[PDB]
Structure formats: structure tokens, C-alpha cells
Design a protein around this nucleic acid. Sequence first.
RNA 1: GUGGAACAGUGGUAAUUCCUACGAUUAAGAAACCUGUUUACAGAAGGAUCCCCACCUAUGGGCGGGUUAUCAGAUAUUAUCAGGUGGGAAAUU
RNA 2: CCCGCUACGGCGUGAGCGUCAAGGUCUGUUGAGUGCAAUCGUAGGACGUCAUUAGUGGCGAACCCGAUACCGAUUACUGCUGCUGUUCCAGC
Lengths: 784, 242, 146, 157, 121
Amino acid sequence: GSKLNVDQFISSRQFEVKQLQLAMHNSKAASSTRIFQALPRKLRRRTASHNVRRIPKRMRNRALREMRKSDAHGLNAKQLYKARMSIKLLRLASKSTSMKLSMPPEVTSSNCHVRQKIKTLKRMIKESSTANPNIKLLNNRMGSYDCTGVNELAPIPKGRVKYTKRQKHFAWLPTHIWNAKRSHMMKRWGYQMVWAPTQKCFKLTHRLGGDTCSSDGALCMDSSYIGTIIVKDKSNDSEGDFLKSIIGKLTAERANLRKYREGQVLFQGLIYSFNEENGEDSTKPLGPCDVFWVQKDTAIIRLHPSIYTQVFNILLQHKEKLTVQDCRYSLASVTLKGAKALESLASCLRSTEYSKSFEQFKMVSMITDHNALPQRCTFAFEAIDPRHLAAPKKLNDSQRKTVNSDDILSLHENYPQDEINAVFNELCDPESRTQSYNNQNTLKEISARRYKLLTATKTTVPFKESDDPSIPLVIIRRLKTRDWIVVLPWFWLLPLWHLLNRIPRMYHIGLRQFQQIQYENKQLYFPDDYPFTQLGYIENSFYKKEASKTKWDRKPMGKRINFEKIKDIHNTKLPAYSGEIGDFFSSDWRFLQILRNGIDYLQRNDKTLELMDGVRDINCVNDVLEFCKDYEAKTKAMSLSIEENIPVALCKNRKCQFRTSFSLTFFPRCIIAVSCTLLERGHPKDNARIYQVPEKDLEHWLQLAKGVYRPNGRKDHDLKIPLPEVHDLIGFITSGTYHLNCGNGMGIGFIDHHAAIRQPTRYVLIRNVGTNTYRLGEWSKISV
Amino acid sequence: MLVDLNVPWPQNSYADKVTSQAVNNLIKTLSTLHMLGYTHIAINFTVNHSEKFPNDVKLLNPIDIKRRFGELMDRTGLKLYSRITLIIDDPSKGQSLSKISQAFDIVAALPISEKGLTLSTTNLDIDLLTFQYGSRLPTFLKHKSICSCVNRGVKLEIVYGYALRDVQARRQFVSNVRSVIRSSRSRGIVIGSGAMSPLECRNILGVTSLIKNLGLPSDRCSKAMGDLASLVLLNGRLRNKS
Amino acid sequence: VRLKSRYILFEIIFPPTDTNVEESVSKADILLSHHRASPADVSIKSILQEIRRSLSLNLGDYGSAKCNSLLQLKYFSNKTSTGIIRCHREDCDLVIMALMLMSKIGDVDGLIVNPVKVSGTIKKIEQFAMRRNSKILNIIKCSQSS
Amino acid sequence: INGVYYNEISRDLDISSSTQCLRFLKETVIPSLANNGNNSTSIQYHGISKNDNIKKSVNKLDKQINMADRSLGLQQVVCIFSYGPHIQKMLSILEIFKKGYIKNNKKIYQWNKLTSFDIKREGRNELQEERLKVPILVTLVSDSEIIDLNLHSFTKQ
Amino acid sequence: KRVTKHPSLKTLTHKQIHTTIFVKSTTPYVSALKRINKFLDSVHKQGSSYVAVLGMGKAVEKTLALGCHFQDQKNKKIEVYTKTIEVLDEVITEGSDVEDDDKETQLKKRAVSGVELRIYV
RNA sequence: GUGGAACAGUGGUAAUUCCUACGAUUAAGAAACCUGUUUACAGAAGGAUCCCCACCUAUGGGCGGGUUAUCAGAUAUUAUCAGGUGGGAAAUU
RNA sequence: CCCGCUACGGCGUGAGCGUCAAGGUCUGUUGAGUGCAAUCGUAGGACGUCAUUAGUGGCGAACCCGAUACCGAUUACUGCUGCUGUUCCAGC
């Protein structure tokens, strides 16, 4: 041991840091790994060891040299013709859909014969050879048609001859096989939509598509399942008198604004199903709705598919003057989300004419921001088929590197209503979308045109006003869900969709990922976060209860959590009752509303409430709880489909003044939607109980909110937590997931408005499933 | 953040004057404590019970944190607390607690007697109990005298600095510490470094392994070193201030 | 299939036992006074022969039999006096308590051993050691600039 | 607040008292970073508290950029400064002043400096003593591009 | 009068997004230290000179506290710039009984001064 | 033909039992390990009330200059922290 | 390729764009993501099974364990459930 100088010390330690870094890099280089493992974990290909074409071209030479260093069937007389029948059917189907003509209905139904299909495809070619008339002759080479049903619902689409009996029970997305190669889909409704990506993308979609600032990417959702109807007034060519009335009948006076007539912005809100038979009006909460208008009179309304069938049935009930237009297989939108989604979307499309909407969209595409733009951003134009490009390329002008809010206000002042609404009129009418397919080419044809440009003359195919299929294209902003949705015809979507993620910073969304996006932005979701409505309550309660009951009876005894014997749940443990509040599974709003009306009957009976000891005399809590258990035991035998139990309050508080016989459950209870954030340690889960702060213990929770902990220096909650009573419950968290954008726990709950006006402070405690701890938090109101 | 509360002051009697080498040795060993990493420092001083206590107010403490260590407190980034261990054997020339508790902060005791343990658990409102891990066990530890005293609030202290003294003393050290662990029911165990030289200081990772292999679990050891140490610090601080 | 063996980082610190020599009170100055240098006769085999003798005289034979199953010094350099000892996850307690009771080398006395980092992988221990040495360079640069 | 330190040296200041800390910034911090003796600069000092009127302080800054003599060839520098939660108000009285100057086809050359006080406080725990580091914004604005002050530690804007 | 606000323009490229932190008022101190330290660890992979720290309004002071930490204790060269920020706000102008959010929304600009703070490696 | 006991074969399904707390840093990523508390704003952007002096009018008041007090949702806290960590088979290819 | 100087191809900035090349890098990494390969230790409470002398004690395993992710099939073991086959024992 001997003292050294300062400079020699810092030089020796810096040389040691450099030596350790060089040794770590040398160990990482001497670790025997392939160049196949040199790819990122998103791009790793298992079949790249078989064929080299998955590997990047810079790396394929090393892959070839290391792969070199490392190193017509028996068919009977019947199944041969059975195999040749399919090959002949595919060949005749390709020639029939390619040459001139459309599809017969007998081949579409595919429930009679295959020899009749062969004879029909043989007969159509001969009829085209012998004569020009009597032919349903198409307008293009690729087999595209017009699946538009005027005044009736759209039937099962024709699709392809080979993949026809695969569409017998459920229909497909236009990107069905493409999404099927890259995602997990579930079969729930009549379509088959994506559920989750194959590679893990929880935190990935959370960071790139989320509300986080570090969102250097783009996320695309196939939202073709969202069904739209187009309504137009046939009675008068003048101003729309019945349109405002039918909007005020379908929705409330919440979405019938004069502002939405003037500024024509799409609005998403809550629709409720009306029913007027004779002098009586019954209103039930129906679900979400998207309303959009064209300057005064024509309207597109798009929403959830079962709700779409119900709204179409109610609209077909009263169809006296106005003409309805069902669009299930002729128009669909896809949803882009993120910071660079606008840049990739402007990269995917090009211009065919110098217009104002191109200039507005190209300036919007460069700012890389969403919420700084105003509420109305609905752009529409005519563009080229994106099969002309087939390459990831972006187009950006000089623009002198300047972005200010003054140019945004200048685009807000000047809005090209005429051309955008003309594109709207083109997409609503069935004749213009049919005229759009007048020059649709095959991939062989666009490859031949690219070869002609490579021979004559750059990576492009030029536009011709005579023989190129100019499409209508509409890109609009959706406000509360913070995402850009772009709508297009059915057979046009896939040439737009395939070129999207070939931009190297664009990934796809699943339905669980869309639920995560709606969970992150403090928003709401219809199959899960809407329990108040009829269909949401039915689907959520039935499916989650049956799934959880099958899982509970599926697990053996003594390995799962046992819900029957849990000690110390509430203070003063009530007799004939040892379990948790309601059923242990999915949210029992029936239990909550019967207990709320029981506490209301106790408050109407006396100024205070007693604790404990054909309908027996209600004087305390357990008489209400035994009636709850008896009603649950009765409804386990026969399912309930009579009425709802919990509506919302946010439409009732403003106007109806939330006003509420031997009755225990006839008049339902109204709720407001809240989002509570955890201030204490812990995270929430699904189906979580939501309780009041005690008034005797309010100062203790205020001291815990300010601060109290052991003198070590770190936070303490290992203390005697005072247990409140059973009837202090006010709500249910349906969606419980650890909120990564805040660093805490988020729970979407639904609390009573009378209970909300009881406490002067927003401090509300949460309790998980099968866990006997209480965690305080603070809620903010969800105005959705 | 860690608390080390058993560093001795190189003086035993008030008649002996501390030389200049002992002050420098204490500065070196406390800087060695800050070198390996500790937040709180509570230096200890030994007072015999047979010694006659002085009738003074500002002269009870020959430690002087303000004039000597007040510079190192500002430069290094730590603090010093004062504490007294009471070598009590027989009930004679004593029973005075109202004056020594106000000047100093933490009041500890060293019983080596059978009746001394009883008079320590009965009529001494002290913070920590210390046993002589260097010498032999006094009589025998039982659950009856320990459990009645730990539940009151007094903690039992283990000196891991006395183990690095001799070779023969290590056996009696282990035989005392394992007896304290089996009698303590693994609750009231505060550990401290009794180093007189800077060559005998260790870090948290070795001391945690030592107390883990001697018989205390990893939860109770680290939970003690944080919570019970910083709790008895505010016990002394509230006996001072309030 | 693999083996779950833990690595332990240790550093040799020399306490400045100088009773007649005065001392300077600072952070990076006492880091300079403790992180001085390793002596001349210090190698891998010398530290292994010393720690096996300490394991014998302190912990015994059968405890030394359990400890010496995978008792190896994987990386050590005398210029920085930091070393990495491989061990089992069960006897890691025994290895750290053997590192604590290291009193002196047979050639040079007056030294303490600081076990700093324990992990089941050596690559994260190297990443922690680079960051800890970077913080040491930060403290040195702060006291050197002012 | 137990004590206020600047550059690890004990000082007698109070954070709730604005006048004493502004005079300490004027008398001690700015001569420790800039020396007006060895050059030909005319430095006009101004501090901003959170109770100051914005329009009146900008109008005071409208007279300090043209206060010294133009015939002597002296470059005129305005040293505006604040500390802590007053700095934001300073920023308004900064940038609106820039809004009052760039419309006349002229330019402000700007130098920024960020230093700090270190204050000690007792915590919610008694043995835990907390340290808070209060930021100081010092901005030197001028119409000249090159100033002979020792401004190597600043930030050109 | 009911009025609501929107966030600010963030014109960023591929390389500017991974090296820029935007400090909120609810942003903790040690959280900001950890995030800017992770940005200093990843800026060699991003391959740029500085890490940007931007704040406006109430966060500005504690944003400057970030520049008070890494300049002295870690010897980092920082640059301090004062910028203007335009914010669009939706306000209601009075001109039945409708819901409070369903009224006439008019955009009004509002300027806030803010601080950019660049930290070198 | 029935009931009980034992064995064998196949089909379906499940596996850290679950919860709670703790495990050194102004050197602020050391319980073994990872991620997060980053779409910056207190309608404090010519902010509000108030002190003194001078001016004009009078039944109210306004302007200019100077220092500077109070206020920004629970009169508070700028420097803490949260969550997770193996499976039907991850072995076999 | 646009701006300024200079004018035969030139020079300086934009934290601008397009093409090409490089065993320079890929924690660009996944509600686990290591890469000489982490997935921990302990205490208390709830539940299940088995054995008790006073009432408690032991056990919650077997097989096995990522390295890009997905799904089908096969193999190793425990428990539950339905079917089938064999043996033994009776109600008349």
C-alpha cells in the first residue's frame, strides 16, 4: 500500500474501465452465435436456416458461407380425378373472373354441385365467344364487384371460388389471410377479426401507439367490422326536416347540435334504443355510435355489429320516406394511431391532381402531433391505386423548416367543403364506387407497366386520366379515441393496407391491443367497459361467469384460491355469510342495486341504520343479503332477460335531476363513470370492489395521503387498517391493468351519484379479488 | 441508509486524558465507516456503575461533537450521536437516570451479573441491552427474562466488531451470539460495530452473511438494521426533545 | 440445461493506519487514500491460496469441502484490486462470510476486503462495476475540478 | 429551512425574503461569473420577483437597453436575473420583451446561466435532514454579437 | 366560463424523439434523473450529441433543477435556451339547456415561455 | 345383470397454493433481474388587489415614476416510488 | 438538390431529403428477456391432504426448466373425470 497521484489514479481507473468494456465486447464477440441471431427479435425467422431469402441481402452471403461450412405421387383412379376437379375449377374460375364477366349465384352458394359449377363456367365462356349481349360483363381484370344492398341488408359476399365453403358460417375480413398469417383471431361475431398479434406487443404497442411521447412508430387496426349505414331524405330535395328529428329520436339532444351541422365534424357518443308502440316510450341504453353528416342532409352512422343489426332493424321498422343504405361489404375503415402514422399514411398515397386537401394533409403529415390540431379534420380527395408504387417511399417538400400554429389556423379558416363533400357523395352512391373499378389491373399488369417504364425510362408508374382507376379516399380524425381513421371501399382496402406496414416503423393492432389503447387514454370499450347497457351486461356477465365457473370447477381442490373460507373480510362478520360480496366472479350489478335499495329503505325507515339482528321485515343488512342470496339462487335456475339493473347518471344528472308498494328492486340505480388512480402501494385487477372512505377514519386516510411511515426512511403500510362495514360498497372496477404511463394502478369504476355527492372529498378505497387489503386512491370523472 | 451505533470512545475513566493519537485513531475509523458506507454514526463511551457521577450540566459529556466533529459533519456529510453503555453489576452507588438521559441520547447497559439482568429489566428505562461477547456467558439466558423485556421495547445488541479481536475469542463469541439468537425469538436484535481501529470495519454484505449464518434470518436482520435502529434513534431523540 | 452459479465481486481496501500523520477530510480524497494500490506479490493463485487457508482455519474441512466444489477466481487484476469469485447459490453465504474474515495476506498485513456485488451472472456484475467505477470517476472529477 | 449555502460556503439568507437574496445575487454571484473592470461594457442589473407587473418591468427594460452613452463606444448589456419560482415570471418578462423587439427588424443576442443555492431543511422524519437545490436563472441580453466579458461558461442564444 | 386546453406542437424527426424528455409538473425528480440517465446510456446507440430536456410552466423550475444536478455532480456541459410556446385553447362564447361540453368551441392562442436544456455526454 | 376393492389402456384438463410486509446509496439503476412514473403549462402572457409622490376633474376615477407585501384546487410536501419474474411441457424438432 | 463567397470542376451551415456501401451497433427486448445464460431468501395469515399420547407436526409435489413469437403432434410424472377389460367377494 502506497499513496499515488490524482492523474495516475484517474488514468489507471479509466484504463480499467476501457479494459472491462473491451473484455465484455470480446466475450460477446467470442460467444458462438449465428448471424441468424444477429437479427432483432422481431425479425428473427425460424425457417431462415432452410432458405436464405428471409435474411437481409448484406447478411445472406455470410449465411451461405456458414451454411456451406456447417454442412407425382401414388393416387388411385378416383382421387386423381377428385384432385383434378379442384385444379380445373380453379383454372376455370381464374379465367372466368379474369377475362370479362362476373360470378353466377349458383357458384356462390356452393350447396348443390361442383359439376354444375364446371358446366356454368364452361357455358359462360362459350356465350362470350358466340355473342356480345346477355353477359353480365365487368369493368376490370381482377374479380371485383359491387356488393351494395339498396333498402335491404347486405348478404354473404361472393369472394373466391376456392375459399367459398370456408366462408359458409362466418364471413371474412378483406385482409383475412394476411392478418391470419401474422395474428391470432377469435370467432365471436359473424366476422373473424384479429384479437392479438403473434409476437408479444403489450409494452410495444403501449409505447408506440400510446399516449407516451416516445412513440416513434405507427399502429394500424383492421376495423372493417364496424358497420355503417347511409341515410338520405327522399321526401324533399330541399332542407332536411326529418333528419334532425330522426337524429333526435335515435340519440339524445346531446349529438343533435347546430354546431355539428355547421362544422360537419364526426361525433362519437352514446346511443340508446328507443321504442314507441302506442303512446309510450321505453328507452334502454344501447351502446356507442359514430355520427357524420354531409353539409345538411345525408348521414353515415357507424357502430358495433350486433348494435348495427339492432339499429338496422329499428331503422327498417320506420322506413316510410327516407332511403336506407346498408354497407357491410362495400365500405370499411382502418385505424392508424401514433406519432408517425400520418407520415406513413402520406407515404402510402400520392396525388393525381393539385388540390387544397392535398396541401392540408401534407402539412398535417409533417407536424408529428395529434391534439394540437383542432376538433374538425376531415380530409377527402381522389388518389391513385397504391399498387403503382409497391415500395416504401416518402415524399416531403422543402418547406423552409417551419411549423407554427398560425398555418394551422390558416388551414382552419379555409376548408375545401365542395371537393371533400363531392368525394363523400362519390363514396355514398353505389354508381360511383362501381365506376371506380373501371380500370383495376392485375399484379401482372402493374408489373408489366413497371417493366415498360424500366425499359423506356425512377421507381413509379405514371397516372393516366383515361385508363387508371382514380379512387375516392377519405381520412378523418376521431376525437376521444385520439386516432385517425381512413375509410375506403372493400376491395380497395387491401392495395392500401399491404403498402402500409412495408414502411419499417408500422405494426398491426389486435383487439386486446385496441382494448389496451382504450385503457391507456382513459377511454371506454363496449364489450368490456360498458356494463350498463343491455348487450354489454348480457355478453360480459354471461361469458365471464361461464368461463370463470368452468375454470373454477376445472382446477383441483387445494391448488386454487378457495373463495368459500376467507376469514377477516369485514368488521362484525354477519351470520350465515362467510364469503365475499356477491358472486366471486364478474360484476354483480344486481347485488349492488338490491343492496343500494336496501340501504335506501333503511334510510327511509329511520334516520340511522341498524348493524345486525312474503318478504321479512327489513331492519338491517343481513336481511337484505339473504334476499340477495335467494334471488341469486332463483336466477341460477332460470336466466334473467327481463330488464336492466344499472343505467348511467351523466345523462340523468343534468336534466332529469336524478330522481329515484312493497318494492326491493323495480326502480334501477344510476352511476357515473370514474377513473381512480392508486396513491398507495399495489395494483388493481379485474372485478375489483370499490368502497367509501369511513367518516370516523377520514383523518387517518388524509394522514396516509399526506404522509406517515416508519422512521427508517421508506414508506410503510404494515399497520392496523380499520375495516369499514359491508354496505360501504359503491362500485366495481371491470378492467384492472397496471398503468405504465403513470407508474401506478388505474381502475375504471362506476360509482353512484348520490354516493358521489355524499363525500366532500374524492378519496375512495379499492379491494382486489380474494385479497383482504384496502388501498386508497383518487378518482377523476370520465365524460364519455 | 444504515445506522452504526457501537463505536467506542478511547477512554474509560474521567481522570485519564485522551491523547492526540486516540482522537486521530477515532477520526480514521469513523472515516473508514463512511468509506464502506454508513449514514448514521452513534459513538459509544463506557461508564462504570462504581464510578462516581459528576454533579455537572455541561461537563457530563467528554465527547464534544460540536467543536471537533462539527467540521467533519459539514465536510464529510454525516452526523454523530452520543451514547453511554453502563457497566452495571451490583445495586450500589447509582440509581440516577433523570440527569444522564438528558445530556446523552441513547442509554445502554452491560449486565454481567445474575441480579444485574433482573435490575436491568426491572428498574432501568434504557434503550439497548449489551452482553459481554468477549468474555464468558454470565449465567444462562432464559426466555422468561428476555421476552418480558423485549416486549417492553428494549432491544438486544450484538457486537460484530468484537469478533475480529482474537482467535480464541471467536468461539466464545459464537457461543454467546447463538444463545442470544435462540433466546431472543429473532425479533429484538440490533447489531453494531465495536471497532477501535480502522482495520476492523466491514460492509453490509459480509455482516448480513455473518448474522445470517449465526442464526438470524435475512428478513429480520435487514428489517432490524433499518427499522429498529432508526426507531431507537428517535426513541433517544424524543427522550431528549420531549 | 445449465448451471445456476453465483459470482461475487470483492475489492481490497487498505485502511490508512497512520497515527502520527495527519489526515485530510474529504470524499474523493479519502477515496484516493483507501483506493491507493495493490502490493507487488498479489496474483490469482496467491489470493486463492490465502482464501483456502482462511477457509480451512475459519470454517473447517467439511464446510471447506462444500465451499471448494466451485471455488474459483474467474477474473482479477492487480492494477484495480477487484476480483470475481465463482460459487454456488447455496454456499454464497459461506463464501461471503469467508470473505469477511480475511485478516491479512502472508506478505502484506493491514487490509480489509469489501464484498460489493453478488449476482448469478457475471455480465451484469461487469456492467455494475463499470457504472460504479464511473461514479468513482465522477467523484474524483468533481473534487479535481473544485 | 435551516440554512442557505452557495458554492458550498455558509451564507446568511432566507428563501422567503426576496430582497436579501436578490441583493446577494446582485452583489456576489454576478461578479463571481462576470468582470466589468477589464472591458468596455455597461451592465444594467435587474431582478424580478413574482409580484412584479409584467408591463412595467418590460417598460423598465425598454430604457435599460438604451441608457448608456452612444458616443463613448460602450456596448450595453442588460443582466436580468431571478431564482426559484419567480424565474417563470422572469421568462414572461423576458420573451414578451423579445416580442417587443424583433418586430423592428432587429436582434437580441442572449446568454443564459444556470447555478443554484443549496438549502437544508428538517424532514417529516426528525433524523432525516433534507437538501433542496434552488435554481437560479441569469440572462445577459444585448444588441451586440461579441461581448468581451468572460462568458465561456454561458450559453449563446 | 368553461375553457379547456390542448398540448403543444412537437415537430420531431426519427432521431429527436429518443433523445428528448418533456418534464411534467407531476414528474418526480429521481424519475427524471433515471430517464435522462437512460437517455445518456442510449444516446450512443442513437448517435447524437445532446439529450434535450424541455419544460413549460410550473415544471420549468424543477426542470432547471435537472440542470442543477448533472452540471455539478456529474460534470456535464448543459445549454439553456428560452423559447416561446403557442397553445390552442377551446373557449365557449355565449350567443335550451345543453350539456356543458356540447357548446360552441372557439380556438384562442396563448403563449407560454419555456426552457430547453441540452445535456452533452 | 348388479355393488364394492385392485390393476391395466385411451381421451380431456391443471401445475412457483394464494395474499401481506421487508431486504444499504446526493455515489439517487448494489435484495438476483427488468420496465415505468416523457405527448412540457397554476386560463400568473403585457396576472389581480395594495404603498408613496405629482397631475386633471369632482357624485365616481385615470395616467406616469419607485421599491415591493398577499394569492395560484386537500393554507402542505420540489429529492419518493410501483408492478412483475418459469411451462405444459419451456425437454423432444 | 436550395442559401452566401468565389466563379473551370470549389468552399461553410441546415442537428433537411434520395440512392449506394461497410463482420460499426441491435437490451430496437417480449404484461420474464438472459446472453460464462437472473427468475431470489425469510416471517405471518387463509385452504387442502396424512398422522396424533391434548393438539399439534410434516407436506403443496413429480417431469422439468426460456433465449424470437405462434400452433399441431410425440415423450416423462402426479391428481381428477368418463369408457372398456380382467380378477376376487354376495341378493335370490
